[PDB]
Amino acid sequence: MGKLFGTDGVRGIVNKELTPELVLKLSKAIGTFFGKNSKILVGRDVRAGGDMLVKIVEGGLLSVGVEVYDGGMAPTPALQYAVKTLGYDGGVVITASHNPAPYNGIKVVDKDGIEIRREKENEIEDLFFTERFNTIEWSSLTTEVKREDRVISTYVNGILSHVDIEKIKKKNYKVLIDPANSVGALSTPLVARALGCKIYTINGNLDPLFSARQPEPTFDSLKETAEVVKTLKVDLGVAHDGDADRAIFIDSEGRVQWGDRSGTLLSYWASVKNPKAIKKIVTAVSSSSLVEEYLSKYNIQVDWTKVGSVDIAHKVADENALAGFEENGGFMYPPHQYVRDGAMSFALMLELLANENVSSAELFDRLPKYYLVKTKVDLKPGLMVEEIYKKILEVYSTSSVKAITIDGVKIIGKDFWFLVRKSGTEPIIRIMAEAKDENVANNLVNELKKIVEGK
């Protein structure tokens, strides 16, 4: 996805592109990177190459003198939380995030609990290619991998430590949880149980085949669970992705809400819990401007940024922000941790919902309503994306609106906004735009499509 590393680690179809041989090499590199005698926690989500890959990684880390720990299956926020507060020097999670079932990959989390910074991906990448590995002598190759049984338990308690457990327990909520046949079923339901809810889970059994739906929660994949949400009259529903670092909700009406709608509501509650903290949150240009509208009437500035969760986690930390979030679910609550944490989100939601004494459906309605229209258009050869940018910019900019070119080109105007961004995976430019008036949005997309087409 680069030389190795993509947007969220190294990944590929298991036993084909992501082969045991590659992971074995990537492991000597990661191990050499952390150093001899470093304590590294290894965990995994539910995916297809699960066991095979954990054995390869462990074998790889021993060859380079790492003191290896096995944390079994768990949400990534959970594994990360473990390395963050349990003393580890870092960790490596076997996961392909949201990718379809045949994928799997390697995420590497640094000393702080967040995935390694990019400059570090390069160090590992260099080590991998130059093969400079701290391979150790036979006589010091005498260690067994140890077991780590505190990750889930430590995680849940950590999460529970930030919400009024009794207040919520009192509301005795009726919730539905869609862990997508994965690792999220080992913890979100546990947090629900502590907040005393009646719990219904769809796809709560572990199945690396993801038969019921794609692991990535989208209006399309949630289509059917949104149904059962309604048919079961639940007060709130929550869906996760493969390693549960994401959380998109479904209210009492049985309608799914997008990551930035709930990120905004959650970004709000975070200020209520910390008047002392710098009213200010971070979010990617992929997020609806609706966030500014709503957080504005609370003095919470929204710091726009590039697309990418790892980066956000760092920016939130680096600027001691209130919180951070992506439009795709995944919200960062600093007091807990800087990374996206689905269960953490589900818990905060039940709090916010509990203290407002309003239904999920109503709660969400308190937000600005915008209509989204998106599209993909191929990048014609002999046409540079920098030229498209230059154009739409000098045609849509105006002292009326405001432009953000930290990643592609985002334009924000009264009751409408858009983002034209170059894909890094496909030779395509994504065009998304929404407005309080569905027609000015559709129209917007059309105009943009033209310009992107080099007219």
From Swiss-Prot:
Sequence positions bearing Phosphoserine: 97
Cofactor or coenzyme needed: Mg(2+)
Keyword Cytoplasm: no
Cofactor: record remark: Binds 1 Mg(2+) ion per subunit.
Matches recorded under InterPro entries: A-D-PHexomutase_a/b/a-I (IPR005844), A-D-PHexomutase_a/b/a-I/II/III (IPR016055), A-D-PHexomutase_a/b/a-II (IPR005845), A-D-PHexomutase_a/b/a-III (IPR005846), A-D-PHexomutase_C (IPR005843), A-D-PHexomutase_C_sf (IPR036900), A-D-PHexomutase_CS (IPR016066), Alpha-D-phosphohexomutase_SF (IPR005841)
SUPFAM superfamilies: Phosphoglucomutase, C-terminal domain, Phosphoglucomutase, first 3 domains
Binding site for Mg(2+): 97, 241, 243, 245
Active site per database record: 97
CDD domains, alphabetized: PGM_like1
Modifications after synthesis and translation: Activated by phosphorylation.
EC number assigned by the record: 5.4.2.10, 5.4.2.13
Catalysed conversion reaction: alpha-D-glucosamine 1-phosphate = D-glucosamine 6-phosphate; D-galactosamine 6-phosphate = alpha-D-galactosamine 1-phosphate
Primary enzyme class: isomerase
GO biological process, one term: carbohydrate metabolic process
Keywords: Isomerase, Magnesium, Metal-binding, Phosphoprotein
Listed GO MF terms: magnesium ion binding; phosphoglucosamine mutase activity
Known function: Involved in the synthesis of UDP-N-acetylglucosamine (UDP-GlcNAc) and UDP-N-acetylgalactosamine (UDP-GalNAc). Catalyzes the conversion of glucosamine-6-phosphate to glucosamine-1-phosphate and of galactosamine-6-phosphate to galactosamine-1-phosphate.
UniProt similarity note: Belongs to the phosphohexose mutase family.
The protein, known as: Phosphoglucosamine/phosphogalactosamine mutase
Provenance organism: Sulfurisphaera tokodaii (strain DSM 16993 / JCM 10545 / NBRC 100140 / 7)
